[PDB]
């Protein structure tokens, strides 16, 4: 997370950390808990190639990475079948836990939006995670969960920005309809934040609008962050995840 600050303990009870086996169980992506047995993340974190399940774990909300880990094994990885790269789109995946978790005030699921929600500019939206704090800069120990308020920008405005300083033809769409754009040069998600949730308050309820997917660098001029638009993928998600 670039900009913003350390998140309070009481906030974002759905944030998860995905971990890959190595010298230690290292954080490589974010995720959100959307049901006690299911985590929603980005496909590019875990695909498109099939990886070994035993080498992946999940860690539910922690204020500080690594310090009191209790890692959770994963029984299935389901990746959107249209997924190949983040720029093509469909950058969405689900992890099913081997056991359901116990919800509580500090750990519980985020609500998905109804299909009709478009999340227009000036909706209040936050993004969270343990990723880099600027291009090339790692989050320092002790690795606090960070959060930042990001302005949503309409898709046609963001597509046109991505064409400024580019060779790509104006009628060749870079930002697609399954995508959502947010952030500016002071406030963006970054590497290590991928797979995490963009959430917006709507009628006093938190809704996950987006999944951190890609961008051109972090907080660069004319390059807002691009998120996978969850409304677009609800049917796919409900093929696997109960209501």
């Amino acid at each position: 997370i670039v900009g913003g600050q350390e998140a309070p303990r009481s906030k974002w009870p759905w944030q998860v950390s995905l971990r890959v086996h190595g010298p230690y169980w290292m954080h490589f992506c974010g995720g959100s808990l959307i049901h006690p047995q299911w985590v929603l993340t980005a496909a590019h974190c875990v695909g498109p190639d099939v990886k070994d399940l035993a080498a992946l774990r999940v860690q539910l909300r922690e204020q500080h990475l690594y310090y009191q880990d209790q890692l959770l094994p994963v029984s299935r990885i389901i990746v959107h079948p249209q997924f190949y790269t983040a720029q093509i789109g469909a950058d969405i995946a689900l992890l099913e836990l081997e056991e359901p978790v116990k919800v509580s005030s500090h750990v519980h699921t985020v609500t998905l939006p109804p299909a009709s929600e478009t999340f227009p500019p000036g909706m209040p939206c936050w993004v969270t995670g343990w990723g880099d704090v600027d291009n090339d800069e790692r989050l320092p120990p002790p690795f606090p969960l960070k959060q930042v308020k990001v302005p949503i920008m309409e898709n046609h405005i963001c597509d046109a920005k991505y064409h400024l300083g580019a060779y790509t033809g104006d009628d060749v769409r870079i930002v697609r309809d399954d995508m959502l754009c947010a952030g500016n040069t002071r406030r963006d998600s970054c590497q290590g934040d991928s797979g995490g949730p963009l959430v917006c308050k709507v009628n006093g309820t938190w809704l996950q609008a987006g999944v951190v997917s890609w961008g051109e660098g972090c907080a660069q001029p004319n390059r807002p962050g691009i998120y996978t638009r969850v409304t677009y993928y609800l049917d796919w998600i409900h093929h696997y995840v109960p209501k």
Copy 2:
């Protein structure tokens, strides 16, 4: 180039090296001289973001990079306007030299195929360059130009191989129709060979079939190298380059 060897000095008289200005004029990409004033290369070498022409030069065939440099400036870069990333396609660009090259036996143009030209499966083609000799292993000094023989493979077969050990649905196309596959787990192009030519000898003549574009690593199982198909872009090429 993976699994190849050093080229004879008489061969590949069309091969070029693109150089970016820093502490030295460093090779980043290959290209092919297709007309006295024109170089064919991959769009991803020089886009999609617009770059400064002063920071770019071209070097014609050299047995060993850096030794006997005579660097040529570029008057124009033309990136295909449908290009945004290699995996979406239109990974093709033209550089216009500021001056015609005086052609000779050591330095001359390669022939573009006719629109009708089908390079049948199994046909022996060759790819050349100064790229990595394996995954994350740089070409050692003195940077000899390497060459390797790679069989062409039908798109259908190549697409299907990219689906093996992947989550992408089998109906969802990875290798697109403006692309061509060639290579295997012993013989491939690699990073720094990008933009370089895939050439086949057809009816005793050398034709350029491909431009090194991308792949999943170099020489991995079921992940042949992927080339921009030059026949697909002949009319765009000839819109700028004299016939």
Copy 3:
């Protein structure tokens, strides 16, 4: 620490971590609290070149680096004046805290030996720190304090081992008389343990025998770790530190 394990929270109440200012207060060296206002460490951690005191702090015993930091400033660095490199010797320094530490059971001073104290060969001593767990392998998050039991070895034997597989003439001393050796190919201190304490329990009391100083790598054959011998520097220590 190579070949060791995580220390119990009750143990090593004198261990300290020195921190240098950058994007975070990063651990670079260990030390030992020998008096309420004084830390013993290795000169090579803070010299021979003069450094800025504002850029330096001290952290008292912590189970996991970075988590619960309460960083203490330093009023003075005193590097032994005969020090230039570790292999020549006098690798010993004092830091004077700006304030006395309020001592407790969790945080208290270690005892310096008497001048007469010979730590006989084979005696079991312990070394502690947050350094590398092998050659060029960092301590993984969450950075637990490690401990390891290392037998003391006579200088004559240690010197002779350093001569094996070396060109240095056998009459030319490598391990000097202000130094002490301990450790073997399974059990050693490593980079980032520097300045930390080698302690032995003698007649039921913990005495500091050594300061982690240098070695040829960590846990290599015939290259035991080398420590500054604290008895050699007692009078220099007591010239500054209250008895």
Copy 4:
């Protein structure tokens, strides 16, 4: 070499490159030819630990590293028996070739000084090699041999400079009598230049005064380069190398 420029082909016919086996025969140190079967270098290039002979080769004068290598195997490495680190001193070693080389105008030996020569300030001295061109900056391809004129400074002046900004006591000698100092903030040898020759013209004859040994960084304020003083080691050298 920091400062100065590319050496002319006709100059420094005694310069050698030492090479270590890896992905390619990589340059790690300089040397000088002092007899057709003997090369003089620094001990820290090849010691103090015994290395495998088969993994070391020598390359006689080349204008450009790597381009026309003809590597020469080594039958013995003789390191000064007092050697342990460069700061202690005796940083001098000899390599005996398996065959004698053929001398010529482009390749021949350098003359050693008579024991009486002290090389006082304002002697004209040059140092040469293929090392870094500033702190942390590699010599760029094509790797030309560089040379730089360096001012000699008297030993007591250089020792006092090395004490400025240091904790080391004024009467503790850093620069020793077997050492020689040369260079300033514009003109110095650097990493990769070690083992190479400092030569000075005296009565129209080139004499090797020094062997590039160590320094505090390269071209840093108050830290001239330190060379092993060859006059001091003539007897040792003549135990092995004929007149």
